[PDB]
């Protein structure tokens, strides 16, 4: 009985049976069993071809909180009846399971399971209301690595027509094959479309498109809406490549975080805080999908649960009952919390799910285990599960008042009620939890009664209910005034020291418009900030209003004050404004800091005083209404701010109360020498110009303001000649050595050791021409105020003696020029023995485009020169080579007091004085040098 002549076996199964042929390819007795089983598998396959699959009857719409489950097909007694340890039947799942996630895991082609589904389990699931949805991996649907049917790149190219073919085939094979009731997509990066563990962009997009076409063929947007579109993944949504592209096509979204890590998230030391929290996930999905569309899965205790899978996320087997693999008490089960678990924000959940649904009733292994390898009753002993635990848990959830349907007793206005249902939902719990936008445009809405029920709503657009007449808290969402979350956690999470959660509730966005029939509007005592959302022109019938006790800046001239003036005018034109009909006072405006400051310079005289930098310079509180309060007197003018002739602010908010503080905000001073300070105190005893950076307590990188303190005369800013240096010959590694010249101070982690020698040297040219006046080198203490590197005890800067040596020769043979004979010592540092994080010294208008310095810790015994950062100081000065040459020529001639006469000497002295002034100036003016040089060449 050859395997090529079986007819009814799938080409895959045949390829398997012939690979099994190759092994023991000639063993006389095993070549029998392999053919005899390929045969019995062909008999099964043809029994699969001749069955009468049950026609799929219409299934009532899924409504209310649901309970779903992923049943290990390997754990089903009929998937492979040869495995006698599996005794349970997914058909034994109770009616409390609202959703049946068809899992196709470990079912042969000839497997009875398909028929049992089609003829028994699928019918029963229908008759009980359980809808069956098959799940496949993204690899199953995309990629070619074990992509099954998708391996046929000819049958399915990554092309539009190719994608259409792939979709039709996939739906036929996995959905239409059994006329299945739903489509579920595994999104686990493992299930992610993979090929050589490599992202297939065409695979990803094409799977997006093929699911999308199936969703054009099945699901809410599909030809066959009776088939569902589910999506469950272990990956966080922000990593779901199909989230964006499949949201519009999907019918269901499932997510299971089984285990303490999924309940509480994981822990990050870097931020020292929880990560991957439930709320994060539900929010992520909310970026894509509705909380009604969201269902969460927990895990039963699966047989033979190995490390990782052995989550014990539900109640475990009691330690005494060492042979009892079933333990049914949900009380205090983490799954109990799951059954109670609702997302704090957004809205009410779509429902619940279960991973390893085939394990309902089996207890989790006790922790006093996993040291034993060959012994596990609760984990690895086989039991026949009645799914009783699943029934109990599903019923417990099914008895949650939280899911109660929103009804007309909630919103009496059948128009308003229907409109809410249209825009919000049908569950009462939704209203307490609904955290979205609310567009109210049906003019038919005669009364807003029940609107008070909106507790978490994000935005609220009243966009044309002209039949409504009065507006107040009783008909205004609970979220109307500011507040904190009142939703207590039902999550038995692992947060223990993080045991505070007010969760300030942002006051809802209240857009109101087309309430033409509105007569009474009461927003007083809502602590509201602005009038935004209020279509004042639309409250045509407005007759009574009170907005006292808000957080709104009603100071005249504000856009807030503008709307207030309009409303006051409307009242003064309707019945006259008076203390009874209108209330706006008792505001407590919150000052915010201004975005920009204009004081870019603070000038003080040179005196032995000291000044609080921030106070003189870091100042100002602007309102969200744009009200800039910049002084105690400014706050006193706010006290003087009057509305209707009197203030609108609460009498209790003293300027102190009113004032926002710029304390804890830091400063970065920077004197003209590029020296830096951080004392808000600054002493004007020294004539200096400093540059001030304002840092928020929140940020010390982007300055909120820059300033120029000026004691005495202004000074030109220096320049980091070291920026853009060209590394030249030196002991220090030029690649690394540029880091000292790298402009940035650099991090503690970065290496600041020049050379393996108490003294180490580095040459380097400068980027561009300039006037050099100082230099500086950072000690490692700058990098870390506490460093073990000993400081440079003595150091030296020198230039290449280009006057005596051909700089062309040096550039030709830099190593040859490693001699101080090739150099000219220009400066020398020598530590006198005091701790310092850097050293600095002026420079007498130095000129060498190239330089070469050595530093020296002077530490003999394997103490190496380590220098934090290299600072070369001056101004930009083009033609520095030629200008400095002229300067030295002027020096030499001014020495040549015998060569030139007194009449020439006076002009030469004027010229030398000019050059002296020019040595440290910013605008290179070579003209005087040239005129003097012409005079000198004439005199020579």
């Amino acid at each position: 009985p050859s395997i090529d002549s079986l007819h009814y076996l799938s080409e895959n199964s045949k390829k398997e049976f012939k690979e099994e042929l190759s092994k023991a390819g000639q063993e006389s007795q095993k070549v029998k069993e392999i053919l005899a089983k390929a045969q019995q598998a062909d008999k099964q396959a043809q029994e699969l071809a001749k069955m009468k699959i049950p026609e799929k009857i219409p299934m009532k719409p899924l409504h209310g909180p649901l309970y779903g489950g992923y049943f290990r097909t390997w754990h089903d007694k009929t998937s492979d009846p040869t495995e006698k340890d599996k005794v349970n039947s997914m058909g034994e799942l109770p009616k409390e399971v609202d959703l049946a996630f068809i899992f196709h895991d470990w079912t042969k082609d000839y497997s009875l399971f398909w028929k049992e589904l089609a003829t028994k389990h699928v019918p029963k699931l229908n008759k009980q209301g359980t809808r069956v949805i098959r799940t496949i991996p993204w690899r199953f649907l995309a990629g070619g690595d074990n992509s099954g049917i998708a391996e046929d790149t000819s049958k399915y190219p990554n092309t539009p027509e190719g994608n259409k073919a792939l979709a039709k085939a996939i739906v036929d094979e996995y959905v239409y094959k059994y006329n299945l009731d739903g489509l579920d997509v595994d999104v686990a990066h493992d299930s992610i479309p993979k090929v050589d563990k490599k992202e297939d962009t065409a695979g990803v997009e094409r799977s997006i498109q093929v699911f999308e076409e199936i969703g054009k063929l099945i699901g809410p947007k599909g030809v066959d809406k009776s088939r569902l579109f589910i999506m469950d993944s272990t990956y966080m949504a922000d990593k779901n490549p199909l989230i964006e592209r499949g949201a519009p096509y999907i019918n269901l979204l499932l997510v299971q975080v089984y285990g303490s890590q999924g309940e509480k998230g994981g822990w990050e030391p870097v931020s020292n805080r929880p990560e991957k929290t439930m709320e994060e996930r539900w929010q992520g999905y909310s970026k894509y999908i509705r909380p009604e569309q969201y269902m969460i899965g927990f895990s039963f205790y699966e047989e033979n649960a190995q490390e990782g899978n052995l989550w014990y996320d539900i109640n475990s087997r009691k330690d005494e009952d060492k042979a009892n693999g079933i333990n049914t008490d949900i009380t205090g089960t983490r799954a109990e919390r799951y059954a109670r678990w609702q997302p704090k924000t957004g809205g009410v959940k779509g429902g619940i799910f279960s991973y390893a649904i085939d394990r309902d009733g089996v207890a989790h292994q006790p922790k006093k285990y996993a040291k034993q390898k060959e012994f596990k009753d609760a984990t690895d002993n086989i039991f026949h599960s009645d799914y009783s635990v699943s029934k109990a848990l599903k019923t417990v959830m099914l008895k949650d008042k939280s899911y109660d349907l929103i009804d007309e007793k909630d919103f009496p206005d059948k128009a308003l009620r229907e409109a809410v249902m249209a825009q919000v939902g049908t569950r009462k719990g939704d209203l307490e939890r609904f955290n979205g936008t609310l567009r109210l445009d049906n003019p038919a809405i005669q009364s807003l009664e029940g609107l008070n029920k909106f507790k978490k709503l994000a935005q609220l657009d009243l966009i044309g209910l002209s039949r409504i007449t009065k507006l107040d808290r009783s008909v205004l969402p609970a979220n109307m005034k500011p507040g904190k979350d009142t939703l207590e956690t039902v999550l038995e999470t692992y947060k223990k020291d993080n045991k505070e959660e007010p969760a300030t509730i942002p006051p809802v966005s209240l857009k109101v418009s087309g309430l033409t029939g509105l007569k009474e509007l009461d927003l007083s005592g809502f602590d509201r900030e602005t009038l935004a959302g209020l279509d004042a022109a639309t409250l045509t019938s407005l007759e009574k209003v009170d907005i006292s006790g808000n957080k709104l800046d009603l100071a005249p001239g504000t856009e807030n004050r503008q709307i207030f003036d309009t409303m006051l005018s409307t009242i003064s034109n309707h019945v006259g404004s008076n203390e009874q009909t209108v209330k706006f006072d008792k505001q407590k405006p919150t000052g915010h800091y201004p975005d920009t400051y204009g004081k870019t310079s603070l000038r003080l005289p040179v005196a032995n005083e000291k000044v609080d930098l921030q106070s003189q310079l870091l100042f100002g509180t602007v309102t969200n209404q744009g009200t800039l309060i910049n002084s105690e007197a400014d706050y006193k003018a706010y006290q003087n701010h009057k509305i209707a002739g009197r203030s609108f602010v609460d009498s209790n908010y003293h300027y102190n109360n009113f004032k926002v503080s710029y304390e804890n905000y830091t400063v970065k001073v920077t004197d003209s020498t590029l020296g830096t300070t951080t004392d808000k105190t600054l002493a004007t005893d020294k004539e200096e110009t400093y540059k001030v950076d304002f840092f928020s307590p929140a940020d010390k990188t982007k300055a909120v303001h820059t300033a120029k303190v000026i004691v005495g005369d202004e000074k030109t800013m220096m320049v980091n000649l070291a920026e853009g240096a060209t590394v030249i010959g030196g002991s220090a590694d030029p690649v690394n050595a540029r880091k000292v010249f790298d402009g940035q101070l650099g991090s503690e982690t970065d290496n600041i050791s020049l050379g393996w020698d108490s003294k180490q040297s580095i040459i380097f040219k400068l980027k561009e021409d300039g006037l050099i006046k100082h230099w500086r080198f950072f000690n490692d203490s700058a990098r870390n105020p506490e460093t073990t590197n000993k400081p440079i005890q003595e150091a030296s800067l020198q230039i290449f003696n280009i006057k005596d040596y051909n700089l062309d020769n040096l550039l030709e043979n830099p190593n040859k020029f490693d001699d101080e004979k090739y150099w000219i010592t220009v400066d020398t540092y020598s530590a006198q023995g005091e701790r310092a994080t850097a050293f600095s010294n002026t420079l007498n208008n130095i000129t060498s485009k190239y330089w070469r310095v050595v530093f020296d810790t002077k530490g003999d015994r394997y103490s190496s020169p380590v220098v934090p950062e290299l600072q070369i100081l001056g101004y930009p000065l083009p033609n520095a080579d030629t200008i400095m040459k002229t300067v030295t020529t002027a020096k030499e001639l001014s020495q040549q007091k015998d060569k030139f006469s007194q009449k020439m000497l006076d002009e030469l002295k004027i010229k030398e004085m000019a050059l002296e002034t020019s040595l440290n100036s910013k605008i290179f003016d070579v003209t005087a040098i040239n005129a003097n040089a012409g005079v000198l060449k004439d005199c020579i």
């Binding site: 890590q261 990050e268 030391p269 982690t749 290496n751 050791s753 073990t788 190496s864 380590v866």
Partner: protein, 207 residues
């Protein structure tokens, strides 16, 4: 309870300043759901708070391990400073301390000898150019193979076999195509070890 393991940097990393030498103390032993781990690392007996606890690079489930890596200056490791990490966490009775340093002992200059391939090595597709480095203390040292002034990745080394003089020794063999070996472009064994001149040396080879 948890346990700590401190791993010195690669001898090349500690021997090339262009690299950033570091010892990594990681704790993977008995741990719990409580994830707080106040990793603490010292050097020469002075505990440094600063660190860069690696973001968990674990791809998926079942890897709850925290590792801290401390970069160290060469002149600090080299000076034999003893970095001891004492890690405290609530699951632990007290912080656990473990120390590593530059190995104690008189540094000993490696003696390098070049050996050409055995004839069988040219009968092999890959012939082996050998550098035997002996008499080197401490055992930490970096040797490498290059050809035609360019690095040769097909090189293998040996553990620092303690010399009879208390130093360590090894042989390294760079493998090259036996045709390449026959037309051997100039190879160089480049070694960074404090026991080296300029802590850096090249040994030449040519056809």
């Amino acid at each position: 309870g948890p346990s700590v393991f401190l791993f010195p940097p690669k001898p090349k990393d500690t021997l090339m300043i262009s690299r950033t030498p570091e010892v990594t103390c990681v704790v993977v032993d008995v741990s719990h759901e409580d994830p707080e781990v106040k990793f603490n690392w010292y050097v020469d007996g002075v505990e440094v708070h600063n660190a860069k606890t690696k973001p968990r690079e674990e791809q998926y489930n079942s890897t709850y391990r925290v590792v801290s890596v401390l970069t160290v200056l060469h002149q600090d490791w080299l000076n034999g400073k003893e970095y001891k990490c004492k890690v405290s966490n609530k699951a632990l009775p007290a912080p656990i301390e473990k120390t590593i340093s530059k190995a104690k002992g008189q540094p000993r200059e490696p003696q390098v000898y070049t050996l050409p391939p055995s004839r069988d090595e040219l009968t092999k597709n890959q012939v082996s150019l050998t550098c035997l480095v002996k008499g080197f203390y401490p055992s930490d040292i970096a040797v490498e193979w290059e050809s035609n002034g360019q690095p040769e990745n097909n090189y293998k080394t040996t553990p620092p076999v303690l010399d009879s003089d208390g130093s360590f020794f090894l042989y390294s063999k760079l493998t090259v195509d036996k045709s390449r070996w026959q037309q051997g472009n100039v190879f160089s064994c480049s070694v960074m070890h404090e026991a080296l001149h300029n802590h850096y040396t090249q040994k030449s080879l040519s056809l």
